[PDB]
Amino acid sequence: TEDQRNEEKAQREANKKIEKQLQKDKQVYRATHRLLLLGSGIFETKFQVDKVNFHMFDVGAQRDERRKWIQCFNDVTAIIFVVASSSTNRLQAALKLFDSIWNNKWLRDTSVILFLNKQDLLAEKVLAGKIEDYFPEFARYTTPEDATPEPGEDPRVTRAKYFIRDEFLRISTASGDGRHYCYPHFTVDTENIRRVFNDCRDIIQRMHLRQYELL
Amino acid sequence: LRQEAEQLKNQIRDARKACADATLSQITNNIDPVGRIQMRTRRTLRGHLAKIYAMHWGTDSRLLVSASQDGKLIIWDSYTTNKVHAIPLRSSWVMTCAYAPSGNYVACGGLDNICSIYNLKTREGNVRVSRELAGHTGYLSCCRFLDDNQIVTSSGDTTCALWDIETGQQTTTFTGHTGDVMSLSLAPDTRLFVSGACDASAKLWDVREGMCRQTFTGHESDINAICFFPNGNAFATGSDDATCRLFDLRADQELMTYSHDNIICGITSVSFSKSGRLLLAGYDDFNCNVWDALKADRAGVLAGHDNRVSCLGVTDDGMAVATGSWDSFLKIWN
Amino acid sequence: HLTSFGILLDLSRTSLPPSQMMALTFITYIGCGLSSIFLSVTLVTYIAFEKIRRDYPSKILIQLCAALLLLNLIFLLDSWIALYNTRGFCIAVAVFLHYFLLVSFTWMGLEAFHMYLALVKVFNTYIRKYILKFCIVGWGIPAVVVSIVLTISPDNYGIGSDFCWINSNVVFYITVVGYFCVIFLLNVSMFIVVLVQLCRIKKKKQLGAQRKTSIQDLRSIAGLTFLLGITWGFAFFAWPVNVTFMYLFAIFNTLQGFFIFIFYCAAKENVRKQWRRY
Amino acid sequence: QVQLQESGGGLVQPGGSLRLSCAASGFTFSNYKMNWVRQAPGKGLEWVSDISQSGASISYTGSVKGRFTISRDNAKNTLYLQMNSLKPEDTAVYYCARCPAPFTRDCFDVTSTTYAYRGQGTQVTVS
Amino acid sequence: SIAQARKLVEQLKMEANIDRIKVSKAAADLMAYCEAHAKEDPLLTPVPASENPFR
């Protein structure tokens, strides 16, 4: 009928207005580069670096069980894993959370940025004399060659932080299938935003290389 | 009370065994199965940007709502593949969307801890938020509209909650689950409901009474999927243990298991047809392995999704099956 | 019935000796014919299989595969079909041969211009109708450039009075070779720029034990070469080495669409998975 | 019903061996990665050890890595945990946390508060 | 805690007490509905496009 044709014309016009709106904020959304943090509801800090949107998601209000809402973040650009860097045994909780994120069948496609946020707090505990009892293979651990942060830094603090770094990176290498890569860091640190930018640059670079099967 | 609670757990499982009798697989074995279905992808609903974490159909069975973690919420016109009322969302991560039965109101909700209701037929012609139902301390995972003004919401704070749009508060809170609750389903006679959580249990609830009346503890893993049988006297749940099982309200036990040894993947959305003898379960092997629903026969494979099917629902009159998935497209099945 | 594939990028524009010519022709038909058949398998796979067009690389791969198949078809039927004494068809088949080579060239450049928008400019690279706006620069601007040649002198194409290709020297070195160079220099400044940014991440060792060489890695580097058409740069080594690299031009560029099938349709893990279900 | 009836514990002197076991019925044991989680009073839930399907991947926390071993029985549907040379720091309430999804290598939320596939627990007091 | 334990045992007390019929009647009524609506099910048999709105 003509009334049936009239309703379908308005439906197609509303559809094409919606398509125009979704092209516009597809252009917004693909430029967003979402990240997930760990370590009301969900918190948003839309910070821009180098005229690039970065839409951070602190998700603190959700409770301790996280097996089903962490599946929200498999299409995310990165999982910025904030580690308390001190050892209840909160650091091994971060290792188990990283092992759970790393081996998750959805989070297998998305990468994790590791930061070790309370690095300045770690320096007083190891110089006073507390992770040797909390990790047996710290005694058998050796410092890598590319491990110079700063000349004034103590070699014991460097060995401790690199042991904590490769304690996460044992999960990152020794795993099954999964197309994702870890970016550990050592953090007042005003260079963190830049580090997020460079790591997400390498994340989307590696995602495009895997899209080309170059990895 | 831990020693006491094991005794009534042993008493209730014997009441299951007192009414064990003959299982449903043995009784239905004599009659003829439907056999192979061969559902085909009628219409692909393209336009969602991120993964489609949730969907719901309508009573009119023409408009379907689907919710995606891009921040959008499109009331898809499934007959002609048209987008009507694409809601821009305050929360980027939405995990629920109930299309209201009346059809006027549409829910969402997710990691914002807010189930925000959108009225489609606004006076200005642009869809806005009627009331934001804040009050949950956990993530909103499933929502189901009782009517135009009542909406029970499954949530990640271990509590489902019955709300009222007119006052914006909880009518009652369902504090019986011990893990974060995933899926939700209302009965066709809309008097009672059952929700599945990340427990071994998917316990039954009452809308007007407001608390649990019977508990169905049948799955090994996180029940991400639940849907009533079309009479409302039974329901099937689906979990991450690669088994979806059916349970009867008048009974108390597991009925019979819909599992196959090739399936090593979780279940996120189960749904029932017009007749009870069909079960559309959505899987983590990127397909929707549909069963005969009474004989443990895989009635078909709804392959064609590249990523995980996170929300499959059937029309109220039984026309179609639309399985939204994590590859940002829904597909209509028939 | 005799044609050399290097006729497209000879760069010296001297007639090849009739000794080798027959051999290169045997290489070209076993190369371009096995490509064409194999490329068709690639295009029947990709458009049919929606599951494999989800990323932007595969959609540019289709338009590269459609460019190279339509290049390999318009090369076989220029040669097998006799175009001698038929000028209209000769200019037509040569117009389509130039057009399907210029879209063959720039859809390696658009593989590289996508790689500029993927790897060295990584953010804010979403373009609305990304593949359709690449059809304006991949299929449309080479249709413009051929149209300027026709608008210049419709008798540019075909034989002077034999393979029907561009006739003039000034047109060929600008609109083919000069077009190839502004794409090849685009390509090799985004070929080794992939290689430096992919050997960098092979130099990063998480536990001090990096993986230098993988079976997928060796497949991928050679796959990247025929995706960007770096072996079409065996033309630059033309003239001494001249007798050698024109043979290598006929082995690695006739079989390029065959190797694109090998490296992106037969060894791609998601693409081969869909073949078992049919 | 998935119920997790742990056994063991009690007043045991430090340095003395103890066998920790959980009944662990209601789910298919051969499919599930299995866990042990401890919780000291005023400290919180702390992961101790995990065992995968058929003992393929066996990892430990660093408090007990050189002094604990964990075994599982797929036929008898029972998880075991030997304890050896106990310091009096780990006087915690041990709990056989089970991973939620069976066929997945990951294991979430076994140190999460009010976790469904965690047992009632046995008090392991050392002094 | 003791409060959630008391709520759990109260739920277990009132959960057993409700009416619980034999399962053969329940599964028989399920099959009764199945057949009762198999003719009204547009998904068991392939529906022709004359009345199917999805072609």
The position carrying tokens 């060239």 is C105
Q: Residue B132: which H helix or E strand, with range?
A: strand B128-134
Domains defined for chain B, CATH in brackets: 1-333 (2.130.10.10)
The answer to whether B257 and B296 have CB atoms below 8 angstroms apart is yes
Residue B180 contacts C where some CB pair is shorter than 8 Å = no
Distance of alpha carbon C57 from alpha carbon B57, whole angstroms: 35
State yes or no: C270 annotated in a binding site. Answer: no
User: How big is the CA angle at B152 (ends B149 and B153), to the nearest 5 degrees?
Assistant: 125
Q: Which of D40, D109, D114 sits opposite A66 (nearest CB)?
A: D109
Short-list C74, E27, B201, CA closest to D1: B201
b/e code A44-64 from CB counts within 10 Å (16+ = b): eeeeeeeebbbbbbbbebbbe
- Residues of chain A with Cβ-Cβ distance to C194 below 8 Å are 209, 214
The answer to whether A37 and A82 have CB atoms below 8 angstroms apart is yes
Residue B292 contacts D where some CB pair is shorter than 8 Å = no
Domain D6-126 has CATH 3.30.450.190: no
Q: Which residues on chain C place their C-beta less than 8 Å from a C-beta of chain A?
A: 55-57, 115, 118-119, 122-124, 126, 128, 194, 197-198, 201, 206-209, 216, 219-221, 223-224, 227, 264, 268-269
CB contact under 8 A, A72 and B110: yes
Structure tokens, B124: 């200005």
Q: Residue B193: which H helix or E strand, with range?
A: strand B192-197
Q: Give the relative orientation of helices A119-128 and A155-173 as an angle to the nearest 10 degrees.
A: 120
- Residues of chain A with Cβ-Cβ distance to D65 below 8 Å are 135-137
- Residues of chain C with Cβ-Cβ distance to B303 below 8 Å are 277
Strands B223-228 and B114-119: unpaired
Residue B266 contacts D where some CB pair is shorter than 8 Å = yes
Inter-CA distances, C64 with A60, B237, C39, Å: 47, 47, 10
The span from the first CA to the last CA of chain E, in angstroms, equals: 58
> Which parts of chain B fold into alpha helices (H)?
2-18, 24-27
Indicate the residue type of E53: P
Distance of alpha carbon A45 from alpha carbon A57, whole angstroms: 7
φ, ψ of residue A195 to 5 degrees: the values are -65, -35
Distance from CA of A71 to the nearest CA of B (A): 10
Indicate the residue type of D8: G
- Residues of chain E with Cβ-Cβ distance to B236 below 8 Å are none
- Residues of chain D with Cβ-Cβ distance to A175 below 8 Å are 105
Indicate the residue type of C195: L
Short-list A30, A81, A195, A73, CA closest to C118: A30
The answer to whether B285 and B244 have CB atoms below 8 angstroms apart is no
Structure tokens, A215: 């990895």
Helix%, strand%, coil% for chain E, nearest 5: 55, 0, 45
Indicate the residue type of C274: Q
How far out from the chain centre does Cα B327 lie? 19
Short-list B296, A82, B93, A71, CA closest to D100: A71
Short-list A36, A72, D100, CA closest to B139: A72
φ, ψ of residue C49 to 5 degrees: the values are -90, 95
* Other beta carbons less than 10 A from residue C148's beta carbon: 11
Secondary structure (3-state) at B41 = strand
- Residues of chain B with Cβ-Cβ distance to E17 below 8 Å are none
DSSP, res B89 = P
The rounded radius of gyration (Å) of the Cα atoms in chain D is: 13
* Other beta carbons less than 10 A from residue C11's beta carbon: 19
b/e code C31-70 from CB counts within 10 Å (16+ = b): bbbbbbebbbbbbebbeebbbbbbebbbbbbbbbbbbbbb
φ, ψ of residue A94 to 5 degrees: the values are -70, -35
CB contact under 8 A, C54 and B303: no
Cβ-in-10-Å burial (0-12, 13-18, 19+) of B168 comes to middle
Contacts of B89 (CB under 8 A, 6+ apart): B71, B72, B73, B108, B116
Short-list B191, B181, B261, CA closest to B224: B181
The answer to whether C100 and C70 have CB atoms below 8 angstroms apart is yes
Cβ-in-10-Å burial (0-12, 13-18, 19+) of C215 comes to exposed
Distance of alpha carbon B302 from alpha carbon B297, whole angstroms: 14
User: Chains with 3 or more CB pairs closer than 8 angstroms to D?
Assistant: A, B
Q: Residue A208: which H helix or E strand, with range?
A: helix A192-211
Inter-CA distances, C236 with B48, B90, C4, C15, C225, Å: 47, 57, 17, 17, 16
CB contact under 8 A, A88 and D109: no
CB contact under 8 A, B222 and D101: yes
The answer to whether B128 and B119 have CB atoms below 8 angstroms apart is yes
Distance of alpha carbon A14 from alpha carbon C210, whole angstroms: 54
Strands B279-283 and B289-291: antiparallel
Distance of alpha carbon A87 from alpha carbon D89, whole angstroms: 14
CB contact under 8 A, D109 and A92: no
Structure tokens, D55: 């003992």
Cβ-in-10-Å burial (0-12, 13-18, 19+) of B164 comes to middle
Distance from CA of D81 to the nearest CA of B (A): 22
Residue B178 contacts D where some CB pair is shorter than 8 Å = yes
Contacts of D60 (CB under 8 A, 6+ apart): D48, D49, D68, D70
User: Chains with 3 or more CB pairs closer than 8 angstroms to B?
Assistant: A, C, D, E
Short-list A183, A179, A28, A188, CA closest to A98: A183
Where chain B is broken, by preceding residue (C–N > 2.5 Å)?
Answer: none
Within 13 Å, how many C-alpha atoms sit on residue B128's CB side? 7
How far out from the chain centre does Cα C26 lie? 20
Q: Residue D47: which H helix or E strand, with range?
A: strand D44-51
Q: Which of C123, C207, C269 sits opposite A52 (nearest CB)?
A: C123
The answer to whether B243 and B274 have CB atoms below 8 angstroms apart is no
Short-list C57, C215, C212, CA closest to A209: C57
The answer to whether B21 and E23 have CB atoms below 8 angstroms apart is yes
b/e code C164-173 from CB counts within 10 Å (16+ = b): bbbbeeebbb
Q: Which residues on chain D place their C-beta less than 8 Å from a C-beta of chain A?
A: 40, 43-47, 59, 61-63, 65-66, 100-101, 104-115
Q: Which of B75, B78, B139, B264 to substitute to test the interface with A, most A CBs within 10 Å?
A: B139
Q: Which of B78, B277, B297 to substitute to test the interface with E, most E CBs within 10 Å?
A: B277
Q: What is A76-211's CATH topology?
A: Rossmann fold (3.40.50)
Distance of alpha carbon C40 from alpha carbon C29, whole angstroms: 16
* Other beta carbons less than 10 A from residue D39's beta carbon: 18
Residue B15 contacts D where some CB pair is shorter than 8 Å = no
Structure tokens, B116: 């925000």
Structure tokens, A147: 């491990």
Structure tokens, E47: 């529906």
Strands A78-81 and A111-114: parallel
* Other beta carbons less than 10 A from residue D84's beta carbon: 13
How far out from the chain centre does Cα C101 lie? 7
Inter-CA distances, C101 with C68, C72, C137, C208, Å: 8, 9, 14, 46
How far out from the chain centre does Cα A181 lie? 10
> Domains of chain A: which residue ranges?
1-30, 76-211
Distance of alpha carbon B198 from alpha carbon A190, whole angstroms: 40
Inter-CA distances, B155 with B51, B131, C2, Å: 20, 17, 74
Q: Give the chain B residue whose CA is nearest to the CA of C271.
A: B306
b/e code D86-124 from CB counts within 10 Å (16+ = b): beeebbbbbbbbbbbbbbbbbbbbbbbeebbbbbbbbeb
Beta strands in chain A (DSSP E): 35-37, 43-49, 52-58, 78-81, 111-114, 182-183
Distance of alpha carbon C31 from alpha carbon C23, whole angstroms: 12
Distance of alpha carbon C232 from alpha carbon C273, whole angstroms: 31
Q: Give the chain B residue whose CA is nearest to the CA of C277.
A: B303
Distance of alpha carbon B283 from alpha carbon B295, whole angstroms: 19
CB contact under 8 A, A68 and B53: no
The position carrying tokens 């125009």 is A20
Cβ-in-10-Å burial (0-12, 13-18, 19+) of A24 comes to exposed
Distance of alpha carbon B305 from alpha carbon E50, whole angstroms: 28
The position carrying tokens 């096995």 is C34
b/e code C177-191 from CB counts within 10 Å (16+ = b): bebbbebbebbeebb
The answer to whether E29 and B251 have CB atoms below 8 angstroms apart is no
List all residues of chain E from 6 to 45 with a beta carbon under 8 Å from chain B. Answer: 6-9, 11-16, 18-31, 33-38, 40-44
Judged by 3 or more CB pairs under 8 A, whether E touches B is yes
Distance of alpha carbon B287 from alpha carbon D1, whole angstroms: 28
Secondary structure (3-state) at B183 = strand
Structure tokens, B300: 């078909």
Secondary structure (3-state) at B250 = coil
Q: Which long-range contacts (CB under 8 A, 24 or more apart) does B117-120 make?
A: B117/B151, B117/B165, B118/B73, B118/B85, B118/B87, B120/B75, B120/B85
Short-list C220, C227, C259, CA closest to C35: C259
Q: Residue B162: which H helix or E strand, with range?
A: strand B160-164
Contacts of C95 (CB under 8 A, 6+ apart): C146, C150, C157
Short-list B39, B86, B36, CA closest to B66: B86
Indicate the residue type of B230: P
Where chain C is broken, by preceding residue (C–N > 2.5 Å)?
Answer: 161, 239
CB contact under 8 A, B294 and E47: no
Domains defined for chain C, CATH in brackets: 6-277 (1.20.1070.10)
User: How big is the CA angle at D105 (ends A104 and B261), to the nearest 5 degrees?
Assistant: 105
Short-list C138, C173, C160, CA closest to C68: C138
Secondary structure (3-state) at D96 = coil
Short-list C96, C78, C97, C76, CA closest to C86: C78
The size of the B-D interface in CB pairs under 8 A is 51
CB contact under 8 A, C219 and A166: no
Distance of alpha carbon B236 from alpha carbon B281, whole angstroms: 9
> Which parts of A49-104 fold into alpha helices (H)?
90-102
CB contact under 8 A, A166 and C194: no
- The DSSP bridge partners found for residue B51 are none
Distance of alpha carbon B8 from alpha carbon E7, whole angstroms: 13
Inter-CA distances, C158 with B206, C2, C169, Å: 84, 15, 13
Q: Give the chain D residue whose CA is nearest to the CA of A68.
A: D108
* Other beta carbons less than 10 A from residue B154's beta carbon: 33
φ, ψ of residue B204 to 5 degrees: the values are -75, 150
Distance of alpha carbon C144 from alpha carbon B60, whole angstroms: 52
* Other beta carbons less than 10 A from residue B310's beta carbon: 27
DSSP, res D53 = G
Residue D3 contacts B where some CB pair is shorter than 8 Å = yes
Q: Which of B303, B304, B306 sits opposite C54 (nearest CB)?
A: B306
List all residues of chain A from 32 to 71 with a beta carbon under 8 Å from chain C. Answer: 33, 50-52
List all residues of chain C from 227 to 266 with a beta carbon under 8 Å from chain B. Answer: none
Q: Give the chain A residue whose CA is nearest to the CA of B75.
A: A15
Q: Which of C46, C51, C130, C270 to substitute to test the interface with B, most B CBs within 10 Å?
A: C51
CB contact under 8 A, B141 and A61: no
Contacts of B147 (CB under 8 A, 6+ apart): B100, B101, B102, B190
DSSP secondary structure of chain C: ----GGGGS-SS--PPPHHHHHHHHHHHHHHHHHHHHHHHHHHHHHHH-GGG-SSHHHHHHHHHHHHHHHHHHHHHHHHSS--TT-HHHHHHHHHHHHHHHHHHHHHHHHHHHHHIIIIIS-SS---TTHHHHHHIIIIIHHHHHHHHHHHH-GGGBS-------B--HHHHIIIIIIHHHHHHHHHHTTTHHHHHHHHHHHH--SSS------HHHHHHHHHHHHHHTGGGGGGTT---THHHHHHHHHHHTTTHHHHHHIIIIIS-HHHHHHHHH-
The position carrying tokens 């009672």 is B192
- The DSSP bridge partners found for residue B332 are B322
Distance of alpha carbon A56 from alpha carbon A36, whole angstroms: 6
List all residues of chain A from 176 to 205 with a beta carbon under 8 Å from chain C. Answer: 181-182, 201-202, 204-205
- Residues of chain E with Cβ-Cβ distance to B214 below 8 Å are 15, 18
Distance of alpha carbon B301 from alpha carbon B119, whole angstroms: 36
Going across the sheet that includes A182-183, the strands are A43-49, A52-58, A35-37, A78-81, A111-114, A182-183
The answer to whether A22 and A15 have CB atoms below 8 angstroms apart is no
Short-list C104, C11, C70, C38, CA closest to C266: C38
Contacts of A117 (CB under 8 A, 6+ apart): A39, A82, A83, A84, A85, A187
User: Chains with 3 or more CB pairs closer than 8 angstroms to C?
Assistant: A, B
Residue A89 contacts C where some CB pair is shorter than 8 Å = no
Short-list C109, C105, C104, C99, CA closest to C156: C99
Resolution (A): 2.9
- Residues of chain B with Cβ-Cβ distance to A63 below 8 Å are 137-138, 156-157, 180
Distance of alpha carbon A215 from alpha carbon A74, whole angstroms: 19
The answer to whether A78 and A66 have CB atoms below 8 angstroms apart is no
- Residues of chain C with Cβ-Cβ distance to B304 below 8 Å are 51
